[PDB]
Design an enzyme around this catalytic site. Structure first.
Site, PDB file in Angstrom:
ATOM      1  N   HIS A  46     -25.290 -23.539 -14.759  1.00 11.33           N
ATOM      2  CA  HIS A  46     -24.445 -22.435 -15.226  1.00 11.33           C
ATOM      3  C   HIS A  46     -24.799 -22.000 -16.635  1.00 11.33           C
ATOM      4  O   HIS A  46     -23.961 -21.479 -17.357  1.00 11.33           O
ATOM      5  CB  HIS A  46     -22.948 -22.768 -15.119  1.00 11.33           C
ATOM      6  CG  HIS A  46     -22.457 -22.976 -13.707  1.00 11.33           C
ATOM      7  ND1 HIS A  46     -21.587 -23.970 -13.375  1.00 11.33           N
ATOM      8  CD2 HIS A  46     -22.733 -22.280 -12.522  1.00 11.33           C
ATOM      9  CE1 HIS A  46     -21.329 -23.907 -12.038  1.00 11.33           C
ATOM     10  NE2 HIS A  46     -22.030 -22.880 -11.522  1.00 11.33           N
TER      11      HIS A  46
ATOM     12  N   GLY B 130     -14.359 -17.376 -11.072  1.00  6.89           N
ATOM     13  CA  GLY B 130     -13.255 -17.118 -10.118  1.00  6.89           C
ATOM     14  C   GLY B 130     -11.935 -17.781 -10.437  1.00  6.89           C
ATOM     15  O   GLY B 130     -10.956 -17.110 -10.727  1.00  6.89           O
TER      16      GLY B 130
ATOM     17  N   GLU C 271     -22.759 -12.710 -15.173  1.00 13.60           N
ATOM     18  CA  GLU C 271     -24.089 -13.325 -15.282  1.00 13.60           C
ATOM     19  C   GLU C 271     -25.210 -12.279 -15.056  1.00 13.60           C
ATOM     20  O   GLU C 271     -26.238 -12.253 -15.747  1.00 13.60           O
ATOM     21  CB  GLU C 271     -24.195 -14.474 -14.274  1.00 13.60           C
ATOM     22  CG  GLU C 271     -22.952 -15.369 -14.222  1.00 13.60           C
ATOM     23  CD  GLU C 271     -23.160 -16.680 -13.470  1.00 13.60           C
ATOM     24  OE1 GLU C 271     -22.180 -17.238 -12.965  1.00 13.60           O
ATOM     25  OE2 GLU C 271     -24.300 -17.148 -13.360  1.00 13.60           O
TER      26      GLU C 271
ATOM     27  N   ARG D 146     -18.268 -30.269  -3.639  1.00 12.59           N
ATOM     28  CA  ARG D 146     -19.008 -31.342  -4.291  1.00 12.59           C
ATOM     29  C   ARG D 146     -18.104 -32.383  -4.958  1.00 12.59           C
ATOM     30  O   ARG D 146     -17.013 -32.065  -5.456  1.00 12.59           O
ATOM     31  CB  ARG D 146     -19.963 -30.796  -5.339  1.00 12.59           C
ATOM     32  CG  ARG D 146     -20.800 -29.633  -4.873  1.00 12.59           C
ATOM     33  CD  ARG D 146     -21.966 -29.492  -5.806  1.00 12.59           C
ATOM     34  NE  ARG D 146     -22.835 -28.362  -5.501  1.00 12.59           N
ATOM     35  CZ  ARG D 146     -22.990 -27.277  -6.263  1.00 12.59           C
ATOM     36  NH1 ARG D 146     -22.333 -27.129  -7.404  1.00 12.59           N
ATOM     37  NH2 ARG D 146     -23.852 -26.340  -5.882  1.00 12.59           N
TER      38      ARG D 146
ATOM     39  N   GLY E 129     -11.090 -19.875 -12.996  1.00 13.67           N
ATOM     40  CA  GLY E 129     -10.736 -19.780 -14.426  1.00 13.67           C
ATOM     41  C   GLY E 129     -10.170 -18.419 -14.823  1.00 13.67           C
ATOM     42  O   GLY E 129      -9.326 -18.312 -15.725  1.00 13.67           O
TER      43      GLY E 129
ATOM     44  N   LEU F   9     -15.154 -22.281 -13.902  1.00 14.56           N
ATOM     45  CA  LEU F   9     -14.517 -22.858 -12.731  1.00 14.56           C
ATOM     46  C   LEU F   9     -14.677 -21.872 -11.583  1.00 14.56           C
ATOM     47  O   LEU F   9     -13.908 -20.914 -11.489  1.00 14.56           O
ATOM     48  CB  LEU F   9     -13.037 -23.162 -13.014  1.00 14.56           C
ATOM     49  CG  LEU F   9     -12.691 -24.048 -14.223  1.00 14.56           C
ATOM     50  CD1 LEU F   9     -11.177 -24.165 -14.395  1.00 14.56           C
ATOM     51  CD2 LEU F   9     -13.360 -25.449 -14.140  1.00 14.56           C
TER      52      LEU F   9
ATOM     53  N   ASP G 155     -10.637 -23.158  -0.839  1.00 13.85           N
ATOM     54  CA  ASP G 155     -10.034 -21.989  -1.490  1.00 13.85           C
ATOM     55  C   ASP G 155      -8.704 -22.312  -2.179  1.00 13.85           C
ATOM     56  O   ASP G 155      -7.746 -22.734  -1.526  1.00 13.85           O
ATOM     57  CB  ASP G 155      -9.829 -20.871  -0.462  1.00 13.85           C
ATOM     58  CG  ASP G 155      -9.325 -19.576  -1.090  1.00 13.85           C
ATOM     59  OD1 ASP G 155     -10.058 -18.572  -1.003  1.00 13.85           O
ATOM     60  OD2 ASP G 155      -8.202 -19.551  -1.653  1.00 13.85           O
TER      61      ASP G 155
ATOM     62  N   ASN H  70     -16.976 -21.600  -7.363  1.00 14.34           N
ATOM     63  CA  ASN H  70     -17.207 -22.467  -6.192  1.00 14.34           C
ATOM     64  C   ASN H  70     -17.813 -23.788  -6.625  1.00 14.34           C
ATOM     65  O   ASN H  70     -17.357 -24.845  -6.199  1.00 14.34           O
ATOM     66  CB  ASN H  70     -18.103 -21.853  -5.125  1.00 14.34           C
ATOM     67  CG  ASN H  70     -18.150 -22.716  -3.862  1.00 14.34           C
ATOM     68  OD1 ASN H  70     -17.093 -23.025  -3.258  1.00 14.34           O
ATOM     69  ND2 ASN H  70     -19.352 -23.137  -3.471  1.00 14.34           N
ATOM     70  N   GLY H  71     -18.852 -23.700  -7.451  1.00  8.82           N
ATOM     71  CA  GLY H  71     -19.295 -24.803  -8.279  1.00  8.82           C
ATOM     72  C   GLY H  71     -18.564 -24.764  -9.614  1.00  8.82           C
ATOM     73  O   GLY H  71     -18.062 -23.707 -10.017  1.00  8.82           O
TER      74      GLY H  71
ATOM     75  N   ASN I  35     -31.132 -12.726  -6.519  1.00 11.44           N
ATOM     76  CA  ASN I  35     -30.652 -14.096  -6.468  1.00 11.44           C
ATOM     77  C   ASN I  35     -30.782 -14.662  -5.049  1.00 11.44           C
ATOM     78  O   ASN I  35     -29.933 -14.413  -4.195  1.00 11.44           O
ATOM     79  CB  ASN I  35     -29.195 -14.091  -6.953  1.00 11.44           C
ATOM     80  CG  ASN I  35     -28.645 -15.475  -7.217  1.00 11.44           C
ATOM     81  OD1 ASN I  35     -29.224 -16.490  -6.830  1.00 11.44           O
ATOM     82  ND2 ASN I  35     -27.496 -15.516  -7.881  1.00 11.44           N
TER      83      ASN I  35
ATOM     84  N   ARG J  96     -33.452 -14.735 -10.503  1.00 10.13           N
ATOM     85  CA  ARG J  96     -32.713 -15.931 -10.885  1.00 10.13           C
ATOM     86  C   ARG J  96     -33.309 -17.126 -10.214  1.00 10.13           C
ATOM     87  O   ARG J  96     -33.497 -17.105  -9.005  1.00 10.13           O
ATOM     88  CB  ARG J  96     -31.271 -15.825 -10.451  1.00 10.13           C
ATOM     89  CG  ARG J  96     -30.556 -14.684 -11.126  1.00 10.13           C
ATOM     90  CD  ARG J  96     -29.063 -14.834 -10.983  1.00 10.13           C
ATOM     91  NE  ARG J  96     -28.533 -15.813 -11.922  1.00 10.13           N
ATOM     92  CZ  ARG J  96     -27.243 -16.003 -12.153  1.00 10.13           C
ATOM     93  NH1 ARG J  96     -26.329 -15.288 -11.501  1.00 10.13           N
ATOM     94  NH2 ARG J  96     -26.870 -16.906 -13.053  1.00 10.13           N
TER      95      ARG J  96
END
Lengths: 371, 373
Positions: free
Chosen positions: B156, B306, B360, B217, B308, B185, B258, B187-188, B8, B67
């Site tokens: 995603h 993370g 993933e 974002r 979620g 849910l 964070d 970092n993005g 990745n 990826r």
């Protein structure tokens, strides 16, 4: 008896209407188009508005000025003068294309009719008090404060009005109802109103955000503008112009009008079919989103040109919504009438109405409010 | 007994993971952040794997998985890479000019150094290729949309796809029988709606900037904001977009991305942190409402990634006061410190709510082996 004159100026147009507050009758109504060949200058637009009123033999109190953007500072029907007019001119960068024509008209109008007071009513005013969580875009706080960037919202006078009429139709205090209002016109916006106080709306810093419209894209990936700029090498004004004038239904199907669009779909035009599907899906998402925001919703109301007369739009928007509390009764929905009416099934937990909007009447009553 | 190296590539980073697809066991995991260059970055990985007595030239590795963020219109399955396919990929790069070229470069480096094994690319947009036209079409000029390939691509995809499968397995129902919402849910952040296994909506768009409020974002934004910053604030286009991507979201509103640190600032009564958090949750609730309406009937909602997986409060506040839309959480199940796939809804919630850990890299390993047999 008493009458107000409501005016609405664009960059090649001056809509007008004489209206009685206490009764609601409209004494006269027009709009001088193509201004800028036959009618050149806005002085000669209001002047030609008097030759129209003359030819039907025309008890004034005030003159109402429709201004689109009131920024952070103007959210009440305001009494005009030279000092207030001064502060107005400073709002213009928030609404660079929409506002100056109404400043222009404030000054051509007050110049040519000093008899009565002139009172300005702003299309952002109703949404001034949106809660911070809904009013704030998730961008750099400094830029937001310095450049006065927030969700301002528009169609304020209409959303407000319709919410009050929905309360009355149901015979309950506006304070005790949670409502969704869907203003589907040339422009289209949605609102959520909790106890008469607005808690979300679909338009944003500008009238471009939210629902798909006649010539406007509505919601768009923020990356699209940059992409068109660095890769397609188009100018930012060109890009934005395309988003306001060459998008929406015109951009997708080559046609604004929903009665024409219907005929095109009836005739099997795929592009018209896709465009209609894109419009309805976007609206369905906003109905769902706002049911969640409200938590409990008592009524959904349609209003404005498309909302008042397109039974296929109402049916498709609210189809398959029974598990979220909404069911339409087609016998009522399919039957064309004017006036306030109920179109939901008797066993629908959420009531659905059609409420005709009268922005110009609401603008007249507010003017009295200030007197 | 057999594995796949999953890679990745970022503009200055190289994450890697050696996964057993049958097992689901991760033989090794790491990330060479900071990047001398990608040639070296991949060289420095070989050493680490040797530092746990693993040598790739001999360990049953059947594939090297790459990826890639944007698959465009044409790459929507796992794609056995060769020099031709890699020439076409370079043509996609303007659709994701920051995310894609790094993955194209690592594909170069890696095909040379690991030639005795097939190289397979999996695309983060792939799952959403099949979105219905009404969901995937922006309402802009058709011609421009067509020639510039502008549509809602979604991202995603591997995660949404994986969690929708895991949710069905968890509930003991085939995936073709369920309507689902997935809330990734991290970092993005993004949401999807999946009907009998096919995605019917997702929150990211042409790029990864649309939709939910994220770490840095903006998510959803009036297109007029960008034009206005350009003509009135007189900021450059690239600067505005960079602000939207790096200096927005929670970092932009609260100065902190964070959520544990955000939690601490909220408990210490920091008002910017509180407004930031409210903006995040309000945006998320709108998407759950929107996607409930799109689906009509929804059987399950699953949190993942993370935040979620670990933030009970985010989950509580997202779905509070939703009983009339068919959703109620159970406070005890929600606060359960235990990890793993689990239910968090009340017994009387018509919509079931789950937490599903995402993996993933494992999903990609299995996709890599899909293309073999």
């Amino acid at each position: 008896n008493r009458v107000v004159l409501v005016l609405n100026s664009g960059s090649s147009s001056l809509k007008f209407q004489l209206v009685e507050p206490d009764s609601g009758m409209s004494r006269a109504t027009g709009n001088i188009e193509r201004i800028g060949s036959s009618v050149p200058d806005h002085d000669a637009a209001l002047r030609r508005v008097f030759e129209i009123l003359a030819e039907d033999d025309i008890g004034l109190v005030a003159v109402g000025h429709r201004v689109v953007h009131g920024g952070k500072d103007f959210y009440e029907p305001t009494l005009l003068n030279d000092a207030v007019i001064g502060k107005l001119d400073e709002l213009s960068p928030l609404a660079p294309l929409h506002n100056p024509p109404a400043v222009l008209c404030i000054r051509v109008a007050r110049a040519l009719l000093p008899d009565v007071p002139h009172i300005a009513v702003f299309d952002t005013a109703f949404f001034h008090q949106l809660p911070p969580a809904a009013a704030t875009y998730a961008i750099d706080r400094e830029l937001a404060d310095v450049w006065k960037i927030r969700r301002y919202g528009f169609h304020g006078t209409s959303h407000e009005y319709v919410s009050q009429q929905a309360a009355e139709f149901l015979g309950k205090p506006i304070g005790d109802l949670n409502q969704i209002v869907l203003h589907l016109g040339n422009g289209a916006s949605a609102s959520a109103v909790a106890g008469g106080r607005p808690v979300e709306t679909s338009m944003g810093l500008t009238p471009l955000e939210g629902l798909v419209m006649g010539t406007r894209s509505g919601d768009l990936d923020p990356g699209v503008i940059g992409y068109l700029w660095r890769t397609a090498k188009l100018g930012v004004d060109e890009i934005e112009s395309m988003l306001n004038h060459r998008s929406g239904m015109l951009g997708l199907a080559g046609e604004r009008d929903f009665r024409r669009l219907r005929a095109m779909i009836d005739d099997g035009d795929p592009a018209a079919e896709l465009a209609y599907d894109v419009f309805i899906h976007r609206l369905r998402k906003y109905v769902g989103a706002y049911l969640a925001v409200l938590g409990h919703t008592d009524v959904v109301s349609f209003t404005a040109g498309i909302g008042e007369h397109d039974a296929a739009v109402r049916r498709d928007t609210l189809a398959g919504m029974a598990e979220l509390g909404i069911s339409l009764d087609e016998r009522r929905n399919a039957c064309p009438s004017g006036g306030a009416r109920r179109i939901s099934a008797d066993d629908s937990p959420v009531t659905v109405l059609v409420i005709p909007t009268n922005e110009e009447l609401a603008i007249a009553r507010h003017c009295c409010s200030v007197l």
